[PDB]
Structure 1
Amino acid sequence: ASTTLMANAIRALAMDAVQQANSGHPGMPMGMAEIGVALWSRHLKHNPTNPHWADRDRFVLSNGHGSMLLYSLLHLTGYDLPIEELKNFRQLHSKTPGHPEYGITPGVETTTGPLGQGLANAVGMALGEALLAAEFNRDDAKIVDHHTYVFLGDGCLMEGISHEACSLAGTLKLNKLIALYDDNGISIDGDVVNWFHDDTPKRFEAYGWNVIPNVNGHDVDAIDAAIAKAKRSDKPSLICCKTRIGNGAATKAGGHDVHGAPLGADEIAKTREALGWTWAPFVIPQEVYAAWDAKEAGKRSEDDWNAAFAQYRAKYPAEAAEFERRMAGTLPADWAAKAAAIVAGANERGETVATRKASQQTIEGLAAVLPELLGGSADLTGSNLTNWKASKAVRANADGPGVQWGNHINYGVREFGMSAAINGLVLHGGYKPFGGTFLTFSDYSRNALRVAALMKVPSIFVFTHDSIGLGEDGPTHQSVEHVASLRLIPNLDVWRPADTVETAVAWTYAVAHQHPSCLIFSRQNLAFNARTDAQLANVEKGGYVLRDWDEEIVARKIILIATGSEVELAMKAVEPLAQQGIAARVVSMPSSDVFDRQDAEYRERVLPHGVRRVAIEAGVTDFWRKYVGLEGGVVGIDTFGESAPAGVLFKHFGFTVEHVIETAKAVLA
């Protein structure tokens, strides 16, 4: 059963599943068929029966629209993806969505579709493998050794994020990363040369990559040999595979309408004749299956690694335990107590610091407790305060390929690439990564935060300099809409702590839960608040009563809802409001997302139905309408900022006791 027959198999499933769904992208799976045979048949180290096998090569389909390529490969090689599913391509609840989705389909390593990000994910996975290896291998016993393969097309290469990820990968000498490029002269608008005339080999050599240019992308033997050559490189490798889009189509190969549209029944019948593929839709003859199936080889590969690991466990019982725990993403055994100790510690200290500082202090405590902690900053380490006393900066080896182990990464000025890479580090397993930048620059990395939320993986994204409180850098740096815009992304937890204790709570919560988190810290100092034991336990509920009414008040009730640096203002507002006949309960809402997940009883306790509310936050006001209603009030900022000291701006922009009072009287009128 020839490789033509094996490649053609991919062609038939891709074209027939697209036609069936009358939707999707047949051109790339047909263009890349032989590349598929080359990598998957002759090189990929994997086990269909266990797609969670720790030491498997990681494959990433960065050009995610060509998803039938992956579904064919998963199906053909014997993963648990039955033919029924490929028949249900692009149908509700199928295991075959239009773009591949992590957690939905076995063997799907990450979620792609937004261009460029799969490639950045793959850099993160290569970084994970390289870091773990440096960490867990011993001169007399290796348990970490796998490559990271990524398919990509012209789209990914035009996206800025390819630049960020490949520059970093080159500087970090990630030589087990191997990229195969669907080099076909085509993107969606037509002939790529009219908008994209890069000398791509030259670009990639400039990054410190090895490039294998001009491979015949329809020659299984040629691609195979190029991968072998890549596999022996001192540098990450780009393989340039010259292909024809929809190659094998009877009449439409190389056309500009095979990217994202069905071929039609007529072209499909004629393609069956030209290829000699005699089988009906979704019929695959057993000799194609026998040539593609990897269950046997997979079993052998993984059983071998198990023996390899068992021998490792004998010589290093403690490290083997740690590896298994970390690969599984399980926290230490004494977690609740150590986490409660970090929080108690902050509460005991009672210091008024910037929550960026509170953050660094929490990281100190997390690190002493989580060897898996992997920090980093997008060239703002000194500003974000993401590194800690005992941390080691990850660096490429001076002389050979690979990295020296470390646990804080300087990502460079690459917020988007850092964020996608973090998603890769997380998906790889073995570390608990986070990475920082200024809050406003969440606008550069936004879709990566989004993709973490879609995948439901606990990526942590740290943002500092969160408002006009940052002062003089001015309105291009001063976030106004950002905090609310991140809340709005489904499944993304947003924390904006008021003090050292809310920071400690936010971090330990984030490290321990399944949602990706944005942790949002201030530049400037925020007053410490004191809390009851009951209150300390309620911070983890996202919103809690920081200060209640006294039974002895018997004046007009209001609820002040505040977050982050504005908790101080709500708190300073209480007595002045009392002296005006208003009794103010202060609710601190460090995470509205976590608060919204609470039960109805708890939410009613904190925000009693029918008591009016004023929300206080140095951000856009409309967001708070969900808690304060049409009749409630908001003290916030609905314009861009200005360049001036923080104290000047806070006054200028009406974050004053006087404004809080004025608003409260207006709400209660």
Structure 2
Amino acid sequence: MESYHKPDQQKLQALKDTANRLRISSIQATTAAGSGHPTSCCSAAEIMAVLFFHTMRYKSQDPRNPHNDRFVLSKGHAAPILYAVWAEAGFLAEAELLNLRKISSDLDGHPVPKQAFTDVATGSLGQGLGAACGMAYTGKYFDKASYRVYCLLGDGELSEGSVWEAMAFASIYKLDNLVAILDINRLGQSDPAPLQHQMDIYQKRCEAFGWHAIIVDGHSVEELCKAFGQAKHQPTAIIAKTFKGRGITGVEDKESWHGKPLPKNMAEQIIQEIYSQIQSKKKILATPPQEDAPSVDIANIRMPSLPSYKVGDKIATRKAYGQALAKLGHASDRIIALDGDTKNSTFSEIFKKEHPDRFIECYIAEQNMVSIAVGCATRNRTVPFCSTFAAFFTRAFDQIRMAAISESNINLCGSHCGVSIGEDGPSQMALEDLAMFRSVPTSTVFYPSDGVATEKAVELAANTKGICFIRTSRPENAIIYNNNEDFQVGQAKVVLKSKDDQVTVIGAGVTLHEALAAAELLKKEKINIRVLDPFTIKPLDRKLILDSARATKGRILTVEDHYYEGGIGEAVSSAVVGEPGITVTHLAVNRVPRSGKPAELLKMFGIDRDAIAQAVRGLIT
């Protein structure tokens, strides 16, 4: 309604019956599959019954509806009970539940967004609460809508630090539309969870992190109804004391049963037991939401004008990123920016200054920042751009990995790439970020070499699906492109050519500029080189690279401010291996660097103008 509807005994009995149907289905499906986690389903059965059939408001026939309450199954291995509630709600055919984990079904082992009732993939534990925080932030501050967000976690799961980043985020940002349900079933996978059934200690941890924390009997439908019924001015933690395998005689509260399906003979006996407890076959109906989520536009986002950079002027691509993102924010209210206490260094502060209501300070918590962004992007409510130093996106790789499994459209800009940052040393130097982002199967990897290309990369990323990464650079370099140069995903640029070119040199960011400097060195020796700027490292403009190489005696030289593995050189090599008369030579950083001036480190690690020149001569000779 709006008033809590205090259930009668018959509604409570129907919720109990529902919980027991959900147990039966979880057992049937995992026994049929021969794999899965029925004991992890069974501890959560009353929680699920009460959320889906008393507390939540949602359209049962339209799970993605923007007005619906959100549910995030953070403990994703309880997928079978998620599937069972959506059957119970009438969305999914009951017979399909028995096809769990089959190649002929979309009821996969863990939830995935090919399912209409799933927004984010889980299965890597500890990430759901951060997505839920993004959904709740969006609900309260962007959509300004009445939907609530519910997130179910395991107790072993609570050992992940990412959970506590989300806990802290929710209290900083007063997410009083967010509820975390903790399934304190005492046990993890291979041993008891550290705190077991020390419910007080869970309470104290949640309260210390700013949450309103309520301990309940997690197998009492009435206590759950009551705890979920009351809204707070705080994010609320329902700390539910449960037993793993609840309702499975001789398995409840026992070790050695995580991720183990009941055999067929045992499932039959247990199901008969559970079924004997059910007092009516009649099912409860879902209740729909208040429809107050606003319309969101779906159109291409265009910069309000061309770049206003002048050739020969100098700007760092990190600063051009912030300028471009702010500019883009004037064109569209969909754009939001997130940063992890690095906004002065990534230049996302420019966006904050101009569009403060759409900036989310995420503090020094990169995992959570990525999960917030994923949650904000769900149901296309926003177009997120996250930023930090590229090196520190390695802290969030599992969140990024899961974001691609979640089919998420997020944009990530990592600054401070390579040794060219200079004096801070290797802890701040991204040397593995191309490897990392190239291995994310939905990614587009932009490596803009000047301020014009950076602005164009921001615009293209905004309109590109999947995981978009933009690699920015700390020092200043010259603008080399005209403001009206056309840029496209998968289209490189030849920035220097002559008919007498003897090598095609591929560089990007600072190494493009070093390659141009090398070309000037070499001209002194009457040696000409073609210089190619890839623009995107993934996808790579294989056609222009090969055409170029055919014009320079088959020779390619790649030079990159990155380690040898998984970067530009390996991408180029895999693209052209086998093409006759095509050779690829490679300059990159061969080991952990050290502090010094940018130019000194480019020299030390063999990727400056003199190293390029020397490599070109050796190929010729």
TM-score by length of 2: 0.91
Q: Counterpart of 2:564? A: 621
1:453 aligned residue (382, 404, 417): 404
Instruction: Tell me the distance in 2 between the aligned counterparts of 1:165 and 1:266.
Output: 43
> What residue ranges of structure 1 are gaps of 5+ in the alignment?
135-143, 280-284, 310-322, 395-405
Q: Closer, same or farther in 2 for the Cα pair 1:665/1:88, shift >3 Å? A: farther
Q: Counterpart of 1:320? A: none
Paired letter, 1:242: K
Contact 1:272 1:278 in 2 (8 A): no
Q: Counterpart of 2:131? A: 121
* Structure-to-structure mapping, 1:432-471, within 5 angstroms: 432-471=383-422
CA deviation after TM superposition for structure 1 residue 580, in Å = 3.9
1:61 aligns with 2:73: yes
* Structure-to-structure mapping, 1:14-93, within 5 angstroms: 14-79=26-91, 81-93=92-104
Paired letter, 1:375: A
Deviations 1:77-129 (A, max 9, x none): 012x2234322211125211101001x11211211000111111001111110
1:561 aligns with 2:506: yes
Q: Counterpart of 2:598? A: 646
* Structure-to-structure mapping, 1:529-548, within 5 angstroms: 529-531=480-482, 536-537=485-486, 539-548=487-496
CA deviation after TM superposition for structure 1 residue 348, in Å = 5.0
Aligned residues: 598
* 3-state SS of 1:595 partner: coil
* 3-state SS of 2:151 partner: strand
Instruction: Tell me the distance in 1 between the aligned counterparts of 2:618 and 2:276.
Output: 76
Instruction: Tell me the distance in 2 between the aligned counterparts of 1:278 and 1:389.
Output: 59
Q: Counterpart of 1:324? A: 295
Paired letter, 1:353: I
CA deviation after TM superposition for structure 1 residue 152, in Å = 0.5
Q: Closer, same or farther in 2 for the Cα pair 1:273/1:151, shift >3 Å? A: same
CA deviation after TM superposition for structure 1 residue 484, in Å = 2.4
Q: Closer, same or farther in 2 for the Cα pair 1:432/1:194, shift >3 Å? A: closer
Instruction: Tell me the distance in 1 between the aligned counterparts of 2:509 and 2:196.
Output: 46
* 3-state SS of 1:324 partner: coil
CA deviation after TM superposition for structure 1 residue 32, in Å = 0.8
Contact 2:23 2:42 in 1 (8 A): yes
* Structure-to-structure mapping, 1:218-237, within 5 angstroms: 218-229=219-230, 232-237=231-236
Contact 1:415 1:445 in 2 (8 A): yes
Instruction: Tell me the distance in 2 between the aligned counterparts of 1:422 and 1:216.
Output: 34
Q: Closer, same or farther in 2 for the Cα pair 1:158/1:95, shift >3 Å? A: same
* Structure-to-structure mapping, 1:119-518, within 5 angstroms: 119-134=129-144, 144-193=145-194, 199-213=201-215, 215-229=216-230, 232-277=231-276, 288=281, 290-294=282-286, 297-298=287-288, 301=289, 305=291, 323-326=294-297, 330-331=298-299, 335=301, 338-339=302-303, 342=305, 344-347=306-309, 351-388=313-350, 391=353, 406-518=357-469
CA deviation after TM superposition for structure 1 residue 668, in Å = 3.8
Paired letter, 2:258: H
2:538 aligned residue (581, 588, 593): 593
* 3-state SS of 1:489 partner: coil
Instruction: Tell me the distance in 2 between the aligned counterparts of 1:541 and 1:461.
Output: 16
CA deviation after TM superposition for structure 1 residue 612, in Å = 1.4
CA deviation after TM superposition for structure 1 residue 414, in Å = 0.5
Instruction: Tell me the distance in 2 between the aligned counterparts of 1:93 and 1:660.
Output: 53
Q: Closer, same or farther in 2 for the Cα pair 1:95/1:608, shift >3 Å? A: farther
Q: Counterpart of 1:524? A: 475
CA deviation after TM superposition for structure 1 residue 195, in Å = 8.9
Contact 1:119 1:156 in 2 (8 A): no
Q: Counterpart of 1:612? A: 555
CA deviation after TM superposition for structure 1 residue 581, in Å = 5.0
Deviations 1:127-151 (A, max 9, x none): 11011255xxxxxxxxx11100000
Instruction: Tell me the distance in 1 between the aligned counterparts of 2:138 and 2:363.
Output: 18
Q: Closer, same or farther in 2 for the Cα pair 1:105/1:435, shift >3 Å? A: same
TM-align CA RMSD: 2.5
CA deviation after TM superposition for structure 1 residue 511, in Å = 0.4
Contact 2:493 2:535 in 1 (8 A): no
* Structure-to-structure mapping, 1:93-112, within 5 angstroms: 93-102=104-113, 104-112=114-122
Deviations 1:600-640 (A, max 9, x none): 75664455497210001111124313414674211210211
Instruction: Tell me the distance in 2 between the aligned counterparts of 1:259 and 1:161.
Output: 23
CA deviation after TM superposition for structure 1 residue 193, in Å = 3.2
* 3-state SS of 1:345 partner: coil
Aligned identity (percent) is 24
TM-score by length of 1: 0.84
1:577 aligns with 2:522: yes
> What residue ranges of structure 2 are gaps of 5+ in the alignment?
1-12, 578-582
